[PDB]
C-alpha cells in the first residue's frame, strides 16, 4: 500500500490474495496480476524516490551535527558527495517517472533500447514535472550553500527536496505492485 | 544408506505428509492464536540479562527476540522432543521413520489413491499430499502478495479466525 | 539490520547441526564394508 | 557437387537433396556441427512462431479487444501496456504446449519426422504428395515470415507506428 | 537498503547452486 | 572398508591410517587405481569448473554480506573517516561488554571491521549503493551455477573432451592470450570508460542508461578518425573531488602519470588507457600460433629450432615440447612459478602505486593486503618447485630428453646445488656477521663503530626514475637528459611530482637498514631455492638412494642402514623449504610493516637507526608494537582488539603444538597407544564399545605434514593478529 | 603418453648444421639472402628514422612514424634471416 522507507520495496500486502476468476481483481498473485510492466517500472522508480527522500534527513541531521561542533566547517565533500550520489539519483528517477507518465508505454522499452535518439515524448508535459524542477533547483542550492559555508542553507535546501519529493509521490499515487 | 526408507520414497512421502498436515493445523492455530492476542506479552522483548546472548536479534529496535516468537519456538521444541523419542524409541505398532534395511516398500500410490473415506492409509496419503501442496501454496501466496502468512491464512479462510 | 532474525536461525544450524550431520554421515560412510 | 544456390561453393554433405527446402544453401557449415533433424525442427518452430507473430502485428494494428490495455496498435509498445500476469500466463501455457507436443524430450531425445508434432487436427494433408507441397509451402512462408516479422518489429522501433502504418506513411521527404 | 525479499532471492539462487554443486560432485565421484 | 574407493591398498588397511591417508590422497588423481589419461584430464577439467564456482561464491558472499550488513553507503560519503564493515557478528558466547566493544562502524550491532579493501575497490570501479553491490552478488551466484553446470555437463558422455582437445597447445594459447587475457582487458577498459570514470565524475551510468550516455562528448567519432588524442583532452583537474562533478574533466584515455591528488591513487583515465593498450597487445599476441587457417607458428617447430650452434646447450629444446605437453606437473610448476612472481609483483606494485581511491590511507588494509599476497606468493613459489620435483620423479623420461636443456641440468646438478650452497653460506656468514657486529658494537655504547653500508645501487635506481633525494642527477633525475626530455610531454611531470613527494610509498627512501635486510632477504631466497632445487634435482636419485625414483615422491625413509636416511625423499625437501619460505616472508613482511608504521607515524628515523642491529627489531618493532595487541583484554576490561589478542595466543598455541609432531617421532607414540588399547579392553563397561579401526600412531610422513600444518597455521594467525592489531591500535 | 598433436604443416626444424634449414623462415623460406640483407638495412634505416622523428612523444604523434618505428626490431629478425639464407646458399 506504500513503499518501505529504507528499502523502497512494496511493503503492505494490500490485503489482496483473490484468486477470483472472471474479474481478475488485480490478484497480486502472479498469473492473476492485472498490473502492466509499466506499472511495475513505476513502483520501482517510486521506491528509489522513497530511499532518496528518507535519506534527506540524514544529510539534515549530519549538517546539524557539523554546525553544533566546537569549530564549524561544513564538510563540503560530504555535502557534495551526498548530492552527487543520493540527490542526483532522486532527480533522474523523478524524470523517468515523468517520462512514463507523459509518453506512456513507449518509455517502458516499447521504442527499444535507450538510444541517443529517443523517439518518444520527453519528461516535460507532465503535471508532476514541476516537482522535478523544485528538486533540481534544490540540488543547486545544496551545492551553492556548501561552497559558501552556509549551514542553514544546506538544511533548508534539503528540506525543499523532501517536500518536493513527497509532493511528487502524493500527486502520482504510484501503483503498489507486489507480484 | 538410502535403503532404509529415506529419500524420495513412499515412507518419506507419508512422513512429510503427516508433518505438513500438522503444520497446516499449527499455522491455522497460530493465526487464530495471535489474531485474538492469546499469546501473552507477544510483543515483549526478551532480556539478555535473563536469557543470555541467544535472545539477541540485532533488529535496530530492542536487539532481542520477542516473547511470541520464543513461545512458538518452545511449542515446536515440545513436539521436537516427542519427535526424537518417537524416532529412536517408537511405539510397538507405530510406523517407523527408518526401516529394517530389507523391508518391502509400500506400493506407490500414483496420481490419486483409492478413495477410502476411512481412517485409512489412502486417506492419510491423499490428505498428506494436499497438505504439503497447501504449505507451498500458502508460502508462495504470502511471499507474492507481500502479506504475513498469518494474514494470508486468515484471508484464504474468509477471515473466520480473526 | 534487515531480516535480522536470520543470524540467530542460521548460525546455530550451520555451526552445530550442519557439522553434527556431516560428521554423523561421514562416519557411517567411512566405517561401512560395502 | 557444387551448391545450387551458391555456385562457387561446394554442396554441403549433410543436405543430400532429399530434405524439403534444399537449394544447397549452407555456406557456414552449420550442418557439420549440429544434427540437421534438430536444426529443421528449430527452423520450423521459428517460422511457425514468426508467421503467428507477423499476423499478430498486422491484426493488432487493425483490431484489438474492446478493452483498455489492448488499445495500443504498436506491437512492441502493446507488449508493455497490458497486464503482465496475462503475459506470463501465455508463457507458462507455451511451456506446457512445448512439453506435450515434443513428448517430453530434449535435443537428442526429440528424435519421428522433424517438426511433425502431430497437431494437424483437420485432414488437410489428404494426398501425401500434396502434403509434401504443403511442407515446402510451410517452410517458405515460415522463412519469409521470419524476415518479415523482423522487419515489422524494427520498423516499429524506428517508426513507432506498426506494420501497415509504417508502410502507408513512409517519409519520402527526409532520411 | 536490502529488503528481506531480496535476501530470499539470494537464498533461492544459492540453493540452485547447492543442487548443481551436489550433481557436479556426484559426477566427479562417479 | 570402502572409503578410499580410489585406492584398494588403503581401503584394505585395518587401522585408522586408512581414514587419514584416503583424505590426503583424494586429489592426486594420477595415483588412483585404474586411472587412464582420458579420465585424468576429464576429472581435472570438471574440478576446474568446480573451483571456479567456489571463487564466484566466495566473491558473491563478500558482496552480499557488505550489501546486507555493511556500511558501504555511509563509507562512500566519508571514506577517510568511516571504517568499512565486513560482516556482522552473531556469537552466543559473547558477554555484553564484547557486544558493545564490537558495535563500531556506525551501526547498532556487533560487526567485524574489514581489512580486505573491497570497499575501496568497489568504490573505485563504480559501485555506489547497496543495491548494485547486491546486484553483483546475484550475478556471481548465477555465474557460480553456470560453471557448476558446465563442470557437470563436460563430464557427460557426449560432452567429455578427448585428449587431442586437451593437448591442443596452439588453440588454447591463441584463445587465452587474445580472449581471456586480451579481450577481457579490453572489456575492462570499456567498463572504466563507460561506468567507473563517469561515476568518479558524479554521473551515474548503469544498465538503465548506458546505451544513451556517451563516455565522451565527441563520442566514438575521434576513434574512427585517428584523432585519438582528442580523448586525452581536459583530464581531471587537481581540484577534482572523486565521486562528484567538481573539478572533473572529460578525458577518457590519458597518460598523466602520478596520483590523483585527493585520492592518492592512480588516475582512472591512466588505468583505462593501460587496459586498452595491454588488451590490444595481448590480442595481437593471441594470433601467434597456427590453429586452422595456415598462418602462425607451430610451438614444436620453435622449440626444436632453438639450439645455439655453439653447442653449449646440447640438443637445446628438442623434445621439450612433448615433455611439457605430457607432464601436467611440469605445466603446474611453470604456472605456479609464474603465478608466484605475479602475486609478488601485485604486493609490491599495489603498495607503491595504489589504484583504489583513499586506500593507502587505510594503513590496516594496506598492511593486510601486502602481507596476504606475499604469503600467497611464497606458497605458490614452493609449490612450483615441489611440482618440478614431482615432474622429475614421475613424468620425466630421460630417453625422450637425450642431451636437452632438461637432461643437461641433471648432468651438472652438483654444480648447481654446490653453488647455491656457497651463495647461501656467503650471504649468511656476512649478513648475520654484520648484524651481530652492529649489535655488539651498539651494546658496548659505540654505535658509530657500526658497519653501515649505503645501498647506493638501489638509490641510483631510484634516482634513475627521477628521485631527487640522493643528488645522483642521472637519467630522469637529470634535468637535461635524453631520457628526461623524451617523457616530458607525457608522464614525466606527473611522475616527478609523485616520486619526489615524501607523502606516498613510491620509491621510499633507503639507507643502511634497508641494505642489511635486502641481503637477509637475498639469503633466504637463495636458501629456500637451495632446498627446493636440491629436492628437485636429487628426486630421481642420489648416492644414498640411487634408485630413489622407484619409491615415489613422498616416502618416509629407506631405514636406518647406510648411516640413516630420515628426510631423504623429494617431498621432505618441500617440507624443509616450507620453514625457509615462512622465514623469508616473515623477514619481508616484518621489514615492510616496520618501515611503513615508522613512516606513517612521522618517525622514519626510528627505523633508520634501529634496523641495523637485531635488538632494534626486537624492542622497537616486536616488543613496542605488541602492547595494543596484548592489551585487547586484561583484568581491567576488553575492547574490539580482544579477538586479535585471542588469535595471537591461538597462533602461538598452534605453532608450538606443531613442534610436538616435528620433535617427537612415531616409536614413542605407537608404544603409548598400545598401552591405551590394552586399558580399553580391560576396563569394564568401556570394553562394551569397540573400535572399527585399530588405533595407530600417525605415520612418519603424516606427522611431518601435521606438524608443518600446525607450524604454518600458527605462523599465519600470529602475524595476522599482530600486523592487523598493532596497525589498528596505533593508526600510524 | 598419448600422441601430442601439432598443427598441420608441422615439419622438423631441429638442426645441427652451420645454419638452420630455410624452413625455419616460414613464408620467407624462398627469399634470397640479398633480399633480406637489403630489407634488413632498409628496415633499420627507416625504422630508426621514424623512431628518431618521434622521440619527444606528443599527444598528437604521427601514426605513420609510430608504425614505421616497428621496423627497427623487425630489422633484427631480417638480418638473422639474411645470415641463414646466405649460409644455405640462397
Ligand atoms: C541478426 C540479428 C539482428 C540484427 C542484425 C538486428 C539489427 C538491429 N536491431 Mg535488433 N534484435 C534482434 C536481432 C537483430 N537485430 C533480436 C534477436 C532482439 C531481441 C533481443 C533484438 C532487439 C532489438 C531492440 C530492442 C532494438 C534493436 C535495434 C536494432 C538496430 C541496431 C541498433 C541497436 O541498438 O541494436 C541492438 C541490437 C540488439 C539488441 C540485438 C541483440 C538494427 C536494425 C534497435 C533499433 O534501433 O531498432 C531498429 C532497438 O531499439 N533490436
Ligand atoms: C482451508 C479451507 C478453506 C475454508 C474453510 C475457506 C472458506 C472460505 N473462503 Mg476460501 N480459500 C481456500 C480454502 C478455504 N476457504 C484456499 C485453499 C484458497 C486459495 C488460497 C482460498 C481462497 C479464497 C479467496 C480468494 C476468497 C476465499 C473466501 C472464503 C470465505 C467466504 C466466501 C466463500 O465461500 O468462498 C468460496 C470458497 C472457496 C473459494 C474455497 C473453498 C469462506 C469462509 C473469500 C473471502 O471472504 O476472503 C476474504 C474470498 O474472496 N477463499
Ligand atoms: C487454466 C485455465 C484458465 C483460467 C482459469 C484463466 C483465468 C484467467 N485468465 Mg487466462 N488464459 C488461459 C487459460 C485460463 N485463464 C489460456 C489457455 C490462455 C492462453 C495462453 C490464457 C491467456 C490469458 C491472458 C493473456 C490473460 C488471461 C487473463 C485471465 C483472467 C481473466 C478472466 C477471464 O475469463 O477473462 C476473460 C474476460 C472476461 C470474462 C470479461 C469480463 C483470469 C484469472 C487476463 C488477466 O487478467 O491476466 C491474468 C489476461 O490478460 N489469460
Ligand atoms: C576466448 C576463449 C576462451 C576463454 C575466455 C577461456 C577461459 C578460460 N579457460 Mg579456456 N580454452 C579455450 C578458450 C577459452 N578459454 C579453448 C579454445 C580451449 C581448447 C583448445 C580451452 C581449453 C581450456 C582448458 C583445458 C581449461 C581452460 C580453462 C579456462 C579458465 C581458466 C581459469 C580462470 O578462470 O583463469 C582466469 C584467468 C584470467 C582472468 C587471466 C589471468 C589473469 C592473470 C593471472 C593476472 C591478472 C591480474 C589482473 C590485475 C586481475 C585483477 C583482479 C582484480 C581483483 C583486481 C578460463 C575461464 C581451465 C579451467 O578452469 O576450466 C574450467 C582449463 O582447465 N580452457
Ligand atoms: C593450482 C595449484 C595446485 C594444484 C592443482 C595442486 C595439485 C596437486 N598437488 Mg600441489 N601444491 C600446490 C598447489 C597445487 N597443487 C602448492 C601451492 C603447494 C605448496 C604448499 C603444493 C605442494 C604439494 C605437495 C608437497 C604435494 C602436492 C600434491 C598434489 C596432488 C594431490 C593433492 C592432494 O591429494 O591433496 C588433497 C588434500 C585434501 C583433499 C585434504 C584437505 C595434486 C596433483 C601431492 C602429490 O600427490 O604429489 C605427488 C604432494 O605430495 N602439492
Ligand atoms: C636461527 C636459526 C637457523 C639458522 C642460523 C640456520 C642456519 C642455516 N641453515 Mg638452517 N634451518 C632452521 C633454522 C636455522 N638455520 C630451521 C628451523 C629449519 C627447518 C628444519 C632449517 C632448515 C635448513 C635446511 C633444510 C637448510 C638450512 C640451511 C642453513 C644454512 C643457510 C644459511 C647459510 O647458508 O649460511 C649461514 C651460516 C650460518 C648462520 C652459520 C653461523 C656461523 C657460526 C655461528 C660461526 C660461529 C663459530 C663459533 C665460534 C662457534 C662457537 C661454538 C662454541 C661451543 C665454542 C645455515 C647453516 C641450508 C644449508 O645448510 O645450506 C648450505 C639448508 O639446506 N637449514
Ligand atoms: C621474436 C619474435 C618472432 C619471430 C622471430 C617471428 C618469426 C617469424 N614469424 Mg612470427 N609472430 C610473432 C613473433 C615472431 N615471429 C608474434 C608476436 C606474432 C603475433 C602477431 C606472430 C605471428 C605470426 C604469423 C601469424 C605468422 C608469423 C610468421 C613468421 C615467419 C615469417 C618470416 C617472414 O616474414 O619472412 C619474410 C618468421 C619465422 C609466419 C610463418 O610462416 O610462421 C611460421 C606467419 O604466418 N608470425
Ligand atoms: C507448515 C509448518 C511445518 C511443516 C512441514 C512440512 C513437512 C512441509 C513439507 C513441504 C513439502 C515436502 C513440499 C513438497 C513439494 C513438492 C512439490 C509441490 C512438487 C510436486 C510435483 C511444521 C510441521 C514444521 C510446523 C510449523 O508450525 C508449520
Ligand atoms: C497447419 C494446419 C492448420 C493451420 C494453420 C495456421 C495457424 C495458419 C496461419 C498461417 C500464417 C499466420 C501465415 C502468415 C504468414 C506471414 C507472412 C508470410 C508475412 C511476412 C511479412 C512480410 C512479407 C512483410 C512485411 C512488412 C515490413 C517488414 C514492414 C511493414 O511496415 C510493412 C510490411 C507489411 C511490408 C491447423 C493447425 C488449423 C489444423 C490443420 O489440421 C493443419
Ligand atoms: C568442495 C566441493 C566438493 C566436491 C566438488 C565440488 C562440488 C566442485 C566442490 C563444490 C562445493 C560447492 C560449490 C558448494 C556450494 C554450496 C552452496 C552454494 C550451498 C548453498 C546453500 C544454500 C542454502 C541451503 C539456501 C537455501 C534457501 C532456502 C531453502 C530458501 C527457500 C525459500 C525461501 C525462504 C524464500 C523463497 C521460497 C523458499 C523456497 C521457501
Ligand atoms: C624445479 C623444476 C624442475 C623442472 C621443471 C620446472 C617446473 C620447470 C622447475 C621449476 C622451476 C621454477 C619453480 C622456476 C622459477 C623460476 C623463476 C621464479 C624465475 C624468475 C624469473 C624472473 C625474471 C627472468 C625477471 C626478469 C626481469 C628483467 C629482465 C627486468 C629487466 C628491466 C626492465 C625491463 C625494467 C627495469 C630495468 C631492467 C632491470 C633492465
Residues in CB range of D50: below 8 A, 6 or more apart = D142, D145, D146, D148, D149
List residues bridging with F694 in a β-sheet.
F15
Cα–Cα distance for residue pair B102/B93, rounded to 1 Å: 19
Q: How far is the centre of ligand 10, averaged over its atoms, from the C-alpha of F156 (Å)?
A: 22
C-alpha distance from residue F437 to each of F67, F519, F521 (Å): 55, 15, 19
- Answer whether G6's CB lies under 8 Å from F298's CB: yes
Cα–Cα distance for residue pair F127/F133, rounded to 1 Å: 7
Flag if C33 and F693 touch (Cβ within 8 Å). no
Which of F526, F524, F552, F527 lies closest to F539, judged by CA? F552
Residue with cell 557439420: D32
Q: Which three cell numbers stand for residue A167?
A: 509532493
**Please, which experimental method was used?**
cryo-EM
Q: Which residues of B23-46 are buried (b: 16+ CB within 10 A; e: fewer)?
A: bbebbbebbbbbbeeebeeeeebb
Q: Which three cell numbers stand for residue F282?
A: 595481448
Q: Which three cell numbers stand for residue F102?
A: 564490537
Q: Give A64-104 as a DSSP string.
A: HHHHHSSS----HHHHHHHIIIIIHHHHHHHHHHHHHHHH-
B158 lines ligand 2 (CB under 6 A): yes
Residue with cell 577481457: F184
Q: Which three cell numbers stand for residue B158?
A: 474468509
Cα–Cα distance for residue pair D142/D20, rounded to 1 Å: 13
Q: Give chain B as a DSSP string.
A: --SSS-SSSHHHHHHHHHHHHHHHHHHHHHHHHHHTT-STTTTPBPPHHHH-GGG----TTTSS-BHHHHHHHHHHHHHHHHHHHHHHS--SSSPPSS--SS--PPPP--SS-----SSSHHHHHHHHHHHHHHHHHHHHHHHHH---HHHHHHHHTTS---
Backbone angles phi, psi at F378, to 5 degrees: -65, -35
Nearest-CB residue to F290 (from G7, G12, G57) = G7
Cα–Cα distance for residue pair F631/F610, rounded to 1 Å: 25
Number of other CB atoms surrounding residue F59 within 10 Å? 18
HSE, side-chain direction, 13 A CA sphere, residue F278: 14
The DSSP element (H or E) to which F112 belongs, if any, is: strand F111-113
Q: Which three cell numbers stand for residue F270?
A: 591512466
Residue with cell 579477538: F643
Backbone angles phi, psi at A126, to 5 degrees: -115, 140
Cα–Cα distance for residue pair D32/F426, rounded to 1 Å: 66
Chain A contact for D74 (CB, 8 A cutoff): yes
Residues in CB range of B45: below 8 A, 6 or more apart = B62, B64, B65, B66, B67
- Answer whether F523's CB lies under 8 Å from F431's CB: yes
The verdict on whether residue F206 carries a ligand-binding annotation is no
Q: Give G3-67 as a DSSP string.
A: PPP--TT-------SSS--GGGGGGGTTS-HHHHHHHHHHHHHHHHHHHHTTSS--SS--HHHHH
Cα–Cα distance for residue pair F145/F140, rounded to 1 Å: 8
Q: How far is the centre of ligand 1, averaged over its atoms, from the C-alpha of D106 (Å)?
A: 29
In degrees, rounded to 5, the angle at the alpha carbon of residue F105 between the alpha carbons of residues F102 and F107 is 85
List residues bridging with F4 in a β-sheet.
none
Cα–Cα distance for residue pair F257/F273, rounded to 1 Å: 11
Which of F348, F357, F203 lies closest to F266, judged by CA? F357
Cα–Cα distance for residue pair A48/F212, rounded to 1 Å: 20
Residue numbers in C near E1 (CB within 8 A): 2
Nearest-CB residue to G14 (from F168, F307, F486) = F307
Which of F122, F130, F259 lies closest to F199, judged by CA? F122
Ligand positioned closest to the Cα atom of B135:
8
- Return the sign of the alpha-carbon dihedral for residues B60, B66, B69, B75: positive
The verdict on whether residue F351 carries a ligand-binding annotation is no
Q: Which of G15, G27, G33, G73 to mutate to test the pocket of ligand 7 (most atoms within 8 A of CB)?
A: G27
Cα–Cα distance for residue pair C20/C10, rounded to 1 Å: 14
- Answer whether F333's CB lies under 8 Å from F385's CB: yes
With touching defined as 3 or more inter-chain CB pairs under 8 Å, the answer for chains E and F is: yes
- Answer whether F42's CB lies under 8 Å from F160's CB: yes
Instruction: Pick the residue whose CA is nearest to atom 43 on ligand 7.
Output: G26
Query: DSSP 3-state assignment of A10?
Result: strand
Which of G71, G69, G79 lies closest to G35, judged by CA? G79
HSE, side-chain direction, 13 A CA sphere, residue D42: 9
Residues in CB range of B112: below 8 A, 6 or more apart = B126
Instruction: Pick the residue whose CA is nearest to atom 3 on ligand 8.
Output: B23
Residue with cell 618416509: F556
Q: Which of C6, C26, C30, C34 to mutate to test the interface with F (most CBs of F within 10 A)?
A: C30
Residues in CB range of F125: below 8 A, 6 or more apart = F191, F192, F195, F196
Cα–Cα distance for residue pair F42/F50, rounded to 1 Å: 13
Instruction: Pick the residue whose CA is nearest to atom 3 on ligand 2.
Output: B157
Sort B152 into a burial class: Cβ within 10 Å, 0-12 / 13-18 / 19+. Answer: buried
Q: Which three cell numbers stand for residue F259?
A: 596520483
Length of chain G: 90
Indicate the resolution in Å.
2.7
Flag if F137 and E10 touch (Cβ within 8 Å). yes
- Return the sign of the alpha-carbon dihedral for residues F211, F217, F221, F225: negative
List residues bridging with F88 in a β-sheet.
F111
CA of C7 vs chain E CAs: smallest distance (Å): 12
Amino acid at each position: 500500500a506504500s513503499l518501505d522507507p529504507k528499502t523502497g520495496f512494496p511493503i503492505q500486502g494490500g490485503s489482496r490474495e483473490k484468486l477470483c476468476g472472471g474479474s481478475a481483481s488485480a490478484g497480486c498473485q502472479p498469473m492473476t496480476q492485472a498490473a502492466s510492466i509499466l506499472d511495475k517500472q513505476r513502483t520501482v522508480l517510486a521506491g528509489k524516490i522513497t530511499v532518496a527522500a528518507n535519506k534527506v534527513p540524514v544529510l539534515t541531521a549530519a549538517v546539524d551535527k557539523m554546525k553544533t561542533a566546537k569549530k564549524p566547517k561544513l564538510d563540503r565533500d560530504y555535502v557534495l558527495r551526498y548530492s552527487a550520489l543520493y540527490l542526483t539519483t532522486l532527480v533522474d528517477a523523478m524524470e523517468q517517472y515523468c517520462l512514463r507518465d507523459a509518453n506512456g508505454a513507449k518509455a517502458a522499452g516499447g521504442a527499444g533500447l535507450p538510444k541517443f535518439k529517443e523517439t518518444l515524448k520527453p519528461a516535460s508535459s507532465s503535471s508532476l514535472y514541476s516537482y522535478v524542477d523544485t528538486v533540481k533547483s534544490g540540488i543547486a542550492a545544496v551545492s551553492a550553500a556548501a561552497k559558501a559555508g552556509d549551514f542553514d542553507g544546506v538544511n533548508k535546501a534539503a528540506g525543499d527536496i523532501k517536500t518536493a519529493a513527497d509532493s511528487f509521490l502524493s500527486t502520482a499515487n504510484p501503483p503498489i505492485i507486489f507480484n | 544408506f538410502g535403503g532404509r526408507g529415506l529419500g524420495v520414497t513412499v515412507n518419506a512421502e507419508r512422513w512429510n505428509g503427516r508433518h505438513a498436515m500438522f503444520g497446516i493445523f499449527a499455522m491455522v492455530m497460530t493465526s487464530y492464536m495471535k489474531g485474538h492476542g492469546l499469546i501473552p506479552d507477544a510483543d515483549k522483548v526478551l532480556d539478555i540479562a535473563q536469557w543470555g546472548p541467544l535472545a539477541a536479534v540485532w533488529d535496530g529496535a530492542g536487539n532481542g527476540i520477542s516473547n511470541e516468537r520464543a513461545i512458538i519456538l518452545i511449542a515446536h521444541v515440545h513436539v521436537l522432543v516427542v519427535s526424537v523419542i518417537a524416532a529412536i524409541a517408537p511405539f510397538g505398532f507405530q510406523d517407523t521413520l527408518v526401516k529394517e534395511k530389507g523391508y518391502t516398500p509400500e506400493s506407490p500410490a500414483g496420481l490419486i489413491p483409492p478413495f477410502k473415506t476411512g481412517l485409512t492409509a489412502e486417506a492419510e496419503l491423499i490428505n498428506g499430499r494436499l497438505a504439503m501442496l497447501g504449505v507451498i501454496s500458502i508460502v508462495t501466496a504470502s511471499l507474492f502478495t507481500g502479506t504475513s502468512v498469518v494474514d494470508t491464512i486468515n484471508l484464504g479462510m474468509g477471515k473466520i479466525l480473526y | 539490520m534487515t531480516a535480522a532474525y536470520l543470524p540467530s536461525i542460521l548460525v546455530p544450524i550451520i555451526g552445530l547441526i550442519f557439522p553434527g550431520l556431516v560428521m554423523a554421515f561421514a562416519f557411517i560412510y567411512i566405517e561401512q564394508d560395502e | 557437387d557444387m551448391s545450387a544456390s551458391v555456385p562457387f561453393l561446394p554442396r554441403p554433405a549433410a543436405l543430400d537433396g532429399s530434405m524439403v527446402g534444399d537449394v544447397g544453401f549452407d555456406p557456414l557449415g552449420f550442418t557439420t556441427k549440429y544434427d540437421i533433424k534438430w536444426l529443421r525442427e528449430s527452423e520450423l518452430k521459428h517460422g511457425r512462431v514468426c508467421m503467428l507473430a507477423s499476423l499478430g502485428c498486422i491484426v493488432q494494428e487493425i483490431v484489438h479487444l474492446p478493452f483498455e490495455a489492448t488499445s495500443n496498435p504498436v506491437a512492441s509498445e502493446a507488449f508493455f501496456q497490458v497486464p503482465a500476469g496475462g503475459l506470463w500466463q501465455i508463457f507458462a501455457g507455451i511451456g506446457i504446449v512445448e512439453h506435450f507436443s515434443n513428448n517430453f524430450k530434449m535435443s537428442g531425445s526429440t528424435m519421428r519426422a522433424p517438426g511433425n508434432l502431430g497437431f494437424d487436427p483437420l485432414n488437410f494433408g489428404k494426398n501425401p504428395s500434396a502434403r509434401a507441397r504443403y511442407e515446402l509451402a510451410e517452410i517458405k512462408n515460415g522463412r519469409l515470415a521470419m524476415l518479415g516479422f523482423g522487419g515489422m518489429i524494427h520498423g516499429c522501433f524506428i517508426t513507432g507506428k506498426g506494420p501497415i502504418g509504417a508502410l502507408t506513411s513512409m517519409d519520402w521527404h527526409q532520411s | 537498503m536490502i529488503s528481506d525479499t531480496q535476501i530470499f532471492i539470494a537464498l533461492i539462487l544459492a540453493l540452485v547452486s547447492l543442487v548443481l554443486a551436489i550433481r557436479l560432485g556426484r559426477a566427479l565421484y562417479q | 572398508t570402502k572409503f578410499p574407493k580410489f585406492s584398494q591398498a588403503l581401503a584394505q588397511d585395518p587401522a585408522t591410517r586408512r581414514i587419514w591417508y584416503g583424505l590426503a590422497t583424494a586429489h592426486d588423481l594420477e595415483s588412483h587405481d585404474g586411472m587412464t589419461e582420458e579420465n585424468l584430464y576429464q576429472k581435472i577439467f570438471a574440478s576446474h569448473f568446480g573451483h571456479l564456482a567456489v571463487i564466484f561464491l566466495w566473491t558473491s558472499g563478500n558482496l552480499f554480506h557488505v550489501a546486507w550488513q555493511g556500511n558501504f553507503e555511509q563509507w562512500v560519503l566519508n571514506p577517510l573517516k568511516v571504517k568499512p564493515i565486513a560482516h556482522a557478528i552473531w556469537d552466543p558466547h559473547f558477554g555484553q561488554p564484547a557486544v558493545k566493544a564490537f558495535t563500531k562502524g556506525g551501526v547498532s550491532y556487533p560487526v567485524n571491521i574489514a581489512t580486505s579493501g573491497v570497499y575501496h575497490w568497489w568504490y573505485t570501479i563504480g559501485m555506489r549503493s547497496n543495491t548494485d553491490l547486491y546486484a553483483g552478488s546475484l550475478f556471481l551466484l548465477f555465474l557460480a551455477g553456470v560453471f557448476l553446470f558446465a563442470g557437470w555437463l563436460h563430464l557427460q558422455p557426449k560432452f567429455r573432451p578427448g585428449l587431442s582437445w586437451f593437448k591442443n597447445n596452439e588453440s588454447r594459447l591463441n584463445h587465452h592470450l587474445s580472449g581471456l587475457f586480451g579481450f577481457s582487458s579490453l572489456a575492462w577498459s570499456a567498463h572504466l570508460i563507460h561506468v567507473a570514470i563517469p561515476e568518479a565524475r558524479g554521473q551515474h551510468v548503469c544498465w538503465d542508461n548506458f546505451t544513451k550516455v556517451a563516455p565522451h562528448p565527441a563520442g566514438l567519432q575521434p576513434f574512427f578518425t585517428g584523432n585519438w588524442g582528442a580523448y586525452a583532452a581536459s583530464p581531471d583537474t587537481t581540484n577534482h573531488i572523486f565521486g562528484t562533478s567538481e573539478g572533473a574533466g572529460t578525458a577518457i584515455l590519458t597518460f598523466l602519470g602520478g596520483f590523483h591528488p585527493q585520492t592518492q591513487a592512480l588516475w582512472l583515465t591512466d588505468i583505462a588507457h593501460h587496459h586498452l593498450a595491454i588488451g590490444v597487445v595481448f590480442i595481437f599476441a593471441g594470433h601467434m600460433y597456427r590453429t586452422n587457417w595456415g598462418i602462425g607458428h607451430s610451438l614444436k617447430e620453435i622449440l626444436d629450432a632453438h639450439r645455439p650452434p655453439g653447442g653449449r646447450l646440447g640438443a637445446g629444446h628438442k623434445g621439450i615440447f612433448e615433455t611439457l605437453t605430457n607432464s601436467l606437473h611440469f605445466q603446474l610448476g611453470l604456472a605456479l612459478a609464474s603465478l608466484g612472481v605475479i602475486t609478488s609483483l601485485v604486493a609490491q606494485h599495489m603498495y607503491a602505486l595504489p589504484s583504489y581511491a583513499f586506500i593507502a590511507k587505510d594503513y590496516v588494509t594496506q598492511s593486510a593486503l601486502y602481507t596476504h599476497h606475499q604469503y600467497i606468493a611464497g606458497f605458490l613459489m614452493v609449490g612450483a618447485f615441489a611440482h618440478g620435483a614431482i615432474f622429475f620423479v614421475r613424468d620425466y623420461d630421460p630417453e625422450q630428453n637425450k642431451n636437452n636443456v632438461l637432461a643437461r641440468i641433471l648432468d651438472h646438478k652438483e654444480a648447481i646445488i654446490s653453488h647455491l650452497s656457497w651463495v647461501s653460506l656467503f650471504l649468511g656468514f656476512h649478513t648475520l656477521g654484520i648484524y651481530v657486529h652492529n649489535d655488539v658494537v651498539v651494546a658496548f655504547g659505540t654505535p658509530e663503530k657500526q658497519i653501515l653500508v649505503e645501498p647506493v645501487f638501489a638509490q641510483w635506481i631510484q634516482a634513475s626514475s627521477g628521485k631527487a633525494l640522493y643528488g645522483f642527477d642521472v637519467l630522469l633525475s637529470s634535468t637535461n637528459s635524453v631520457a628526461a626530455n623524451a617523457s616530458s610531454n607525457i608522464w614525466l611531470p606527473g611522475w616527478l611530482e609523485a616520486i619526489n613527494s615524501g607523502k606516498n610509498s613510491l620509491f621510499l627512501p633507503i639507507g643502511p637498514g634497508d641494505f642489511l635486510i635486502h641481503h637477509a632477504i637475498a639469503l633466504a631466497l637463495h636458501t629456500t631455492t637451495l632446498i627446493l632445487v636440491k629436492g628437485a634435482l636429487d628426486a630421481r636419485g642420489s648416492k644414498l638412494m640411487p634408485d630413489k625414483k622407484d619409491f615415489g615422491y613422498a616416502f618416509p625413509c629407506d631405514g636406518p642402514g647406510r648411516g640413516g636416511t630420515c628426510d631423504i625423499s623429494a617431498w621432505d625437501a618441500f617440507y624443509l623449504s616450507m620453514f625457509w619460505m615462512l622465514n623469508t616472508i616473515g623477514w619481508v613482511t616484518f621489514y615492510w610493516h616496520w618501515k611503513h608504521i615508522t613512516i606513517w607515524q612521522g618517525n622514519a628515523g626510528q627505523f633508520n637507526e634501529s634496523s641495523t642491529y637485531i635488538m632494534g627489531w626486537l624492542r622497537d618493532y616486536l616488543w613496542l608494537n605488541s602492547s595494543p595487541l596484548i592489551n585487547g583484554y586484561n583484568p581491567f576490561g576488553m575492547n574490539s582488539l580482544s579477538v586479535w589478542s585471542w588469535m595471537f595466543l591461538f597462533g602461538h598455541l598452534i605453532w608450538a603444538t606443531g613442534f610436538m609432531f616435528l620433535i617427537s617421532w612415531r616409536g614413542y607414540w605407537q608404544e603409548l597407544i598400545e598401552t591405551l588399547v590394552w586399558a580399553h579392553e580391560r576396563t569394564p563397561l568401556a570394553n562394551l564399545v569397540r573400535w572399527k579401526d585399530k588405533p595407530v600412531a600417525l605415520s612418519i610422513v603424516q606427522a611431518r605434514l601435521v606438524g608443518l600444518i600446525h607450524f604454518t597455521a600458527g605462523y599465519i594467525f600470529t602475524y595476522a593478529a599482530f600486523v592487523i592489531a598493532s596497525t589498528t591500535g596505533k593508526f600510524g | 603418453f598419448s600422441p601430442v598433436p601439432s598443427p598441420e604443416g608441422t615439419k622438423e626444424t631441429y638442426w645441427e648444421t652451420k645454419a638452420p634449414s630455410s624452413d625455419v623462415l616460414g613464408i620467407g623460406a624462398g627469399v634470397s639472402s640479398g633480399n633480406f640483407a637489403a630489407a634488413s638495412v632498409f628496415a633499420a634505416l627507416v625504422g630508426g628514422y621514424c623512431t628518431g622523428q618521434v622521440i619527444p612523444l606528443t599527444v598528437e604523434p604521427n601514426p605513420l612514424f609510430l608504425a614505421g618505428s616497428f621496423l627497427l626490431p623487425y630489422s633484427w629478425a631480417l638480418h638473422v634471416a639474411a645470415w641463414i639464407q646466405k649460409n644455405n646458399g640462397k
